[PDB]
């Protein structure tokens, strides 16, 4: 249940993220690979070293997806439909990993939003990322 209240807190917070979305996306991935090494099993074709252009590029795509989800927060299932299919039938990333990336995105946001990352916004963002994760795994089986 991403409440309307959560939706607007997310729109405002992500709005503040603004032009740094891609950077934060890449940073979140880097944090995930270091904090949770098991997530690296999904990127054997990537150089996962600090500064990797592949991690940076993928980060912009993850950010594109999140930005698009925020812009269509009232119908995320539709907005994330292509990605739900991709992760469910091709990538087949175990559902547990979405919580790991979500946590790293929160940490990244906390590290960049001193004033905005209040307890309430922290809760809304967590629920938002959980909602995104649920949508992305909705077609797994």
């Amino acid at each position: 249940v991403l409440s309307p209240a959560d939706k607007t807190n997310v729109k405002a917070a992500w709005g503040k993220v603004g032009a740094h979305a891609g950077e934060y996306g890449a940073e979140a991935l880097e944090r995930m690979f270091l904090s949770f090494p098991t997530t690296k099993t999904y990127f054997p074709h990537f150089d996962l070293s600090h500064g990797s252009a592949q991690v940076k590029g993928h980060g912009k795509k993850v950010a594109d997806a999140l930005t698009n989800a925020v812009a269509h927060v009232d119908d995320m299932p539709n907005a994330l439909s292509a990605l739900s299919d991709l992760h469910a039938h091709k990538l087949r990333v175990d559902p547990v990993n979405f919580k790991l990336l979500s946590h790293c995105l929160l940490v990244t946001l906390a590290a960049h939003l001193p004033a905005e990352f209040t307890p309430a916004v922290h809760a809304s963002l967590d629920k938002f990322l959980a909602s995104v994760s649920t949508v992305l795994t909705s077609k797994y089986r």
């Binding site: 090494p37 098991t38 099993t41 999904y42 087949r92 990333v93 175990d94 990993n97 797994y140 089986r141």
Partner: protein
């Protein structure tokens, strides 16, 4: 995880009457059926389109016996599973790219299979011992990931 002395005896005892090859195929097959995303490591196995196809697939059975064979061997090293599965853990990480969550899912499916197989005999206390073992094995297999 550390099992009590009695739990270890319970585990090694029920196992004596387990066709490792058969249960292995059943456990691996159900894993691919119940959690279909796990089929991502077996595109070379052929037909995995339906439960019947998966369960009867000779390669699924072949891999299942390989997996449970190692699980069975592990039961003789319950005092230190991490040490015993170290090199196998490195292989699953460096060459196979198997997310350790897969080991946890397989462990739960195996418990369901032992229950299906032993019925009445798979008592709650016996399950608890096995539940501890599969977690221990999964943790050991995940230990060398980096």
């Amino acid at each position: 995880v550390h099992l009590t002395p009695e739990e270890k005896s319970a585990v090694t005892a029920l196992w004596g009457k387990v066709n490792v090859d058969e249960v292995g195929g059943e456990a691996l097959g159900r894993l691919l059926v119940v959690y279909p995303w796990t089929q991502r490591f077996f595109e070379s196995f052929g037909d995995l389109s339906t439960p019947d196809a998966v369960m009867g697939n000779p390669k699924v059975k072949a891999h299942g016996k390989k997996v449970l064979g190692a699980f069975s061997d592990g039961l003789a090293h319950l005092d230190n599973l991490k040490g015993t599965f170290a090199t196998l853990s490195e292989l699953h990480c460096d060459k196979l790219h198997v997310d350790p969550e897969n080991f946890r899912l397989l462990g739960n499916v195996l418990v369901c299979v032992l229950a299906h197989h032993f019925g009445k005999e798979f008592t709650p206390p016996v399950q608890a011992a096995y539940q501890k073992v599969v977690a221990g094995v999964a943790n050991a297999l995940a230990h060398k990931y980096h």
